[PDB]
Amino acid sequence: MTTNYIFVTGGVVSSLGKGIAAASLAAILEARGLNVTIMKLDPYINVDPGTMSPIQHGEVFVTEDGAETDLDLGHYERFIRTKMSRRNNFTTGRIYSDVLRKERRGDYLGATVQVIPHITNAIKERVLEGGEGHDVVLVEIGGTVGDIESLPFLEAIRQMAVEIGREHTLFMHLTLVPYMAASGEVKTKPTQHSVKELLSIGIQPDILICRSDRAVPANERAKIALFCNVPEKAVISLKDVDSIYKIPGLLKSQGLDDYICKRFSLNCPEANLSEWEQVIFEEANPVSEVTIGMVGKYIELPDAYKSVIEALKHGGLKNRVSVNIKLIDSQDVETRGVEILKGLDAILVPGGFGYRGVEGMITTARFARENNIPYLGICLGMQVALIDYARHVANMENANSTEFVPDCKYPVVALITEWRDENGNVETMRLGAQQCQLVDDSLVRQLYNAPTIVERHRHRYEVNNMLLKQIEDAGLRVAGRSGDDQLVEIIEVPNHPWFVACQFHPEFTSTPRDGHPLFAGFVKAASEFQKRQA
Amino acid sequence: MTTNYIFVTGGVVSSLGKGIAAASLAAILEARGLNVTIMKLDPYINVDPGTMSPIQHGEVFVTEDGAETDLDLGHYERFIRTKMSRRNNFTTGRIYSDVLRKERRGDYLGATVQVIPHITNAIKERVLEGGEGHDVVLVEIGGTVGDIESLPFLEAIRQMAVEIGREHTLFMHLTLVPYMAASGEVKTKPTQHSVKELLSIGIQPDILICRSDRAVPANERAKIALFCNVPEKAVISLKDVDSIYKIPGLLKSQGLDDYICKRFSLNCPEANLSEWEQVIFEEANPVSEVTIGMVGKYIELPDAYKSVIEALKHGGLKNRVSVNIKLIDSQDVETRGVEILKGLDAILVPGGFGYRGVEGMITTARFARENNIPYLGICLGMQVALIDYARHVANMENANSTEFVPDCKYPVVALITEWRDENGNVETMRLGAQQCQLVDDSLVRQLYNAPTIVERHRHRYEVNNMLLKQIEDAGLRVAGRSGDDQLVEIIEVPNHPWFVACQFHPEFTSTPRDGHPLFAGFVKAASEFQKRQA
Amino acid sequence: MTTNYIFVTGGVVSSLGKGIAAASLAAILEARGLNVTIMKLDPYINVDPGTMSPIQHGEVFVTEDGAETDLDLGHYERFIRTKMSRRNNFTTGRIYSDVLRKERRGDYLGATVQVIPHITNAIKERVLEGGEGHDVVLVEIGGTVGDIESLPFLEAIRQMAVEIGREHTLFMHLTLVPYMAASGEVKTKPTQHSVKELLSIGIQPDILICRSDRAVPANERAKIALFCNVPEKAVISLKDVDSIYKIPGLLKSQGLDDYICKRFSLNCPEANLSEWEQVIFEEANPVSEVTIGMVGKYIELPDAYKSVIEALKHGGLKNRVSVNIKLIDSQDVETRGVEILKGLDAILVPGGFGYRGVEGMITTARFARENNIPYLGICLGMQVALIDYARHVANMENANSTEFVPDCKYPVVALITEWRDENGNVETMRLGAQQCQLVDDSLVRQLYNAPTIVERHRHRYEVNNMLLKQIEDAGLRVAGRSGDDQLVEIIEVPNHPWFVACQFHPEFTSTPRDGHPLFAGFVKAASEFQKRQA
Numbered sequence A, B, C: 001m002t003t004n005y006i007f008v009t010g011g012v013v014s015s016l017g018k019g020i021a022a023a024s025l026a027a028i029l030e031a032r033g034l035n036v037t038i039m040k041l042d043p044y045i046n047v048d049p050g051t052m053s054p055i056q057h058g059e060v061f062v063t064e065d066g067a068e069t070d071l072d073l074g075h076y077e078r079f080i081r082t083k084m085s086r087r088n089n090f091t092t093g094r095i096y097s098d099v100l101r102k103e104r105r106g107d108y109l110g111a112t113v114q115v116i117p118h119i120t121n122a123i124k125e126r127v128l129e130g131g132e133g134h135d136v137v138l139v140e141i142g143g144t145v146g147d148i149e150s151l152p153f154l155e156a157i158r159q160m161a162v163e164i165g166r167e168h169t170l171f172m173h174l175t176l177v178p179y180m181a182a183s184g185e186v187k188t189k190p191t192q193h194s195v196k197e198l199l200s201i202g203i204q205p206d207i208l209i210c211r212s213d214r215a216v217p218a219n220e221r222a223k224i225a226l227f228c229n230v231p232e233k234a235v236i237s238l239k240d241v242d243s244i245y246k247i248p249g250l251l252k253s254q255g256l257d258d259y260i261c262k263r264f265s266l267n268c269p270e271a272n273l274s275e276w277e278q279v280i281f282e283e284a285n286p287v288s289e290v291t292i293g294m295v296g297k298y299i300e301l302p303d304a305y306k307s308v309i310e311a312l313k314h315g316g317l318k319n320r321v322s323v324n325i326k327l328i329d330s331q332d333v334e335t336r337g338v339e340i341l342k343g344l345d346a347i348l349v350p351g352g353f354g355y356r357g358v359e360g361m362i363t364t365a366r367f368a369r370e371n372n373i374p375y376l377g378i379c380l381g382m383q384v385a386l387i388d389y390a391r392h393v394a395n396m397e398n399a400n401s402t403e404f405v406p407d408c409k410y411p412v413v414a415l416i417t418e419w420r421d422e423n424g425n426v427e428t429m430r431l432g433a434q435q436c437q438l439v440d441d442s443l444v445r446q447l448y449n450a451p452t453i454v455e456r457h458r459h460r461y462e463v464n465n466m467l468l469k470q471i472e473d474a475g476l477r478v479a480g481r482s483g484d485d486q487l488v489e490i491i492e493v494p495n496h497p498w499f500v501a502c503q504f505h506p507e508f509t510s511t512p513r514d515g516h517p518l519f520a521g522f523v524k525a526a527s528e529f530q531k532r533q534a
Ligand SMILES: Nc1ccn([C@@H]2O[C@H](COP(=O)(O)OP(=O)(O)OP(=O)(O)O)[C@@H](O)[C@H]2O)c(=O)n1
Pocket: A013, A014, A144, A146, A147, A148, A149, A150, B186, B187, B188, B189, C114, C115, C116
């Protein structure tokens, strides 16, 4: 068994959906019965994404092994059944850190560390590492062709293409075939130049992807084929669509995967894409509609809550119901008040970092709780709900986290070391998929149909425990606890129609094919409530 | 007085309106009291545009001196008063013809004729020729930057620029800033690369033109400025508009001309663009509307009748009336019949070549004539009308032209040498602006308010005097005769509300500010008819 | 006062002598009375040059402030009297280390750290730092134009050229105009392309340097001028010569510096290059010649002992005597023996790290000592000489250094902490220019004509004073000691015609115009001995 590789690059303009295209392909390759995986290389100097804000790049994906990574790794999880790990994504800065450390340790024995070799060697080794044991490995190259930000990576690839042999590697390239209304037609010249640029750095494209807002005419595809030294059959058109789960269908329709198996001499069984065909059918034919309002902070950039948004979608798919998302700034609920929260069927409060308008988040939690409006809390949102309930039911005035107020006097959230009561009596970070003990009598236990459940985490502060007993005894159900320390993983409100809040991140586990019990329940509750409020 | 030059190039995609931008600038420069002119270099092997069809490139402009040239030369005539000549436009093929001829006759004395320097010499000498005696010369380079089709021209320019000095030259480069709805924003990357391409061939841009369907944000303009080595104030945004006549206003708004005179150390007077402001006001505030139907052949690409369309628009401007042009295929009138011609306020028949469904054109002429529907015929449209009237009123069975049916028997149109009667008894191309003697008692004489007029021509066959007397005596007014041979330049129908047809090309003289008597009359009559029918 | 900058780049091939050219220019501009400084940007990933071997890049330059840097910084010291510091040279690796550390510290506040703008800003800042307070700053750009290894730097430069303004910056570029004997002529094509490459990254050259083995014809220079958009007067020819001290003369001859002052509007006084002319005269007219053996380890690459070689040259210039260096592998002395050392007028042993042929080095020291042959030892050579004398005169069997033998038994060299005697009783790196106390009665005190001196260091181990009294009392002169702990700096042999050795690196202070007492004495001694033996 020899591993085959396909490299994916993009030129002309960014924002073409390189990760989406690659993921859609991978889904097909999976559907062809092939051991396909995928990795993404980034042109960033930041070593880890944890040093950047969500407004800067959107939500940071949490892998099973706890690694923080590029959002697109979650996108990969939404197309194939393999698991992403730290080996599936790294940055330019990461490379330098490692190489410079090797320098420091004398690993280059007095030699000059150059871009070529050494830096490109580091890259090559990482690629071989991640692709080990797989039939097909897709590699997404971040950055735009022609920009200096990723030339080292492009070079490392070229080297490997030669080292490995062209019989085990293909060059895929995304372009833009923009529509010029003034002329009344699309243009292909930008594409022609993008290809020329790849050629100037030692790369000859094998497969072309024509991104546009409309199908590109065969004639134009032929013109491209001519100028790029590419067979007409390898020039694929990809018009804009209203769902990424329809793309596998399109790629299959144009015979892309057949071409690929032919190039790799693979005996590939007919792709079974019916899983997504089902999803598409259901997606395009919902029986109902609900409105969910989301109160947060980074709502000016949807990408910041991308994983959440898609998780909501997945719940809606299983319940055949349209999901509307109201973007609400917590600072406005703080300012304007709960009038914002009117006209909603359900309330959503996501996680994140930053005090900002958290008091408006608390206000919202109170609103949903007090008015019995289908409430879902995640990470910070749970902490918010904890505070809400604590202050108004358990009467823990000024309940808060020590991360914002050193002496809350009611620190409902704190570090384990920092656990303490209101009288000052006392007694790092949790990341990745961890097993939680569900309470057999809780809804969540029954939602998963299991005593325990493994879910992803990303957070430093925990439920106090010293003051927990005040909150829990006041009338709050701990629906599940962690492992060794039995930490409050998830809660439910005794008399609320649907109120669930948790520490884990279910949004990184939901799929379009499986959905996810908590979003299924949440969205359903929204519908129930909606019908009740009529 | 030393001539200053500005070169115009464009990259990324074609069809950005290089001629439009250049003409708009020139208009402003004229408005500032500067002696401005303009030339265009074309990347084609065709020596003369007369060897190509109307559908291939659209209408071929006829200059005063009879030269056949690029449509854009007519566009230049519509913005500045400087008259174009054969020296204002030539092609790659033209150059080679000249150079090879010089080789053949020994002008290079045994030397090797090379692109560099001999082809570039042909080019730069022609440029200096055309720019003689002018303050500012705009030079438009056709083709797209990065393509081999025009690299010789770009090289000739580079050399020239060095020779004359930077104090006498500026580089204006058009680009495209495409809007990507999927991202919700415009991109600049393509532009950055386009500039890099010019730089790679020795050209550093001074002024950037950002074509788009919307204003480009100052921030984006600044980003471009950075990467292109260009001052922010020299980065001009140019969004799509509904009228070319509004462009001078936009360029003026962004201070383009001030920059230019500063660069050329010229004490330039403030631009008076009120002439176009008037036009714009009138254009945007017509008092009425009218439907004009046009029957022809090259309607599958409006460019073929561009000069006509503009002329109709100009008539509309003077009569504050919207002109609605219906495109009708002569072959459909031939097939379907006159039902096509219903719902029209007036009918127009353009010139051109090709028999095709001209019988339907004749049918149309008959229709408009017999139903008293305002009619305007140009060149071929006159030939058509001549046949119509001759065959159906003067009883000239099979009235026709020898260019299609030599054995006509009633050749109403024929080469002067070919003039003959129905008994076989007998007795190149007219080009450019020629004097026409108008009949003092004709409407056209009074429409122009002058004994004679001067108008452009292009045709080979003439009205057959041998049979003319039958037609004219039957009841048709010859509204004007040429000169030496008193050739029927223009006719009018005695009892038709407004039926005028002529040999000359009034559409090459009409401007948005001056208008033109025949379009003023036609369009007005069209409106009048409409009102008479309502 | 505003700082002016000149950037120096080069392409086509490596090894053109960019640093040499820049240094020669600086010398002229020094002679024009300008505040000239100079920096070099190192494309390597190594953070410090200390992590690379002498064979990898030759000798590593020691700056006054103790920084280790590129050899060319010493070359700068040999053309201008200003002082280099850590601010005059840094690497690519250094940049990343700094930036990543800033990232780690939260310096970019959650933003994406990108090459553009963050890496380039790091560069920009360092350039402004080093050039602060100077009239003219030369900046040598390492690497080769067109290679990805230095594109980030080239970009940072472009940006600064724009932000600073062209009135304060120039682009100088070295090329190769190779001689093609098969054709019988030189070619310019490579140059034309090199320039095009700079242009493609936003850089337009102002000054061209044509490296070759012969003067380039004015015609060819004109051809280049044409294709590069450069004035003929700015195309400088630079043929190969037998001395780098003749280059200022050549550059002056072609009017380079005048051009520069005109570009910077400087009223520069006529260059006084007579000091260099003197050096040249003396160089080209020695009255004698001597042969000096150099016993070492890195002799396979001259560059490893470059600073030493030049120091020897300078001594020869002052004594009008040719210096013939015989490179000798100390390992061959171990194999073949002292027969290698025959036919020499003087013996020299350079510094360095590694055992290899050190025992042979000792054998050589012994040979020169015992046979009264003008000996000069530096750093390691001193350590060697110490062992020689100690073992063979002070009877310190196996006199040695703890850097090679944990239990030397007679550790004549050791870390200060490691100082111990032969009975086991006891009691980082010295860098940069340090004050040494000379013994008034020593030869070197009188050679320097001063009580104390300041000289550069680069070593960790010291003379073990526990056993010094054995060595010194046996009959050996300590000619100088250091500071606080009076560490042994210089040793002289009581009855040897001329045998000295020292801890410091005099080769980093020697200049072509000033010379250096030590090397003057050494080379002189060689001559004296030569005559003594004749
Ligand atoms: N020749 C250059 C110029 C720019 N960049 C890269 O250009 C990118 C900027 O373009 P893009 O990522 O697409 O986003 P913006 O900078 O906002 O601009 P645009 O989308 O128009 O390119 C930066 O990441 C920078 O690393 C580079 O590497 N090489």
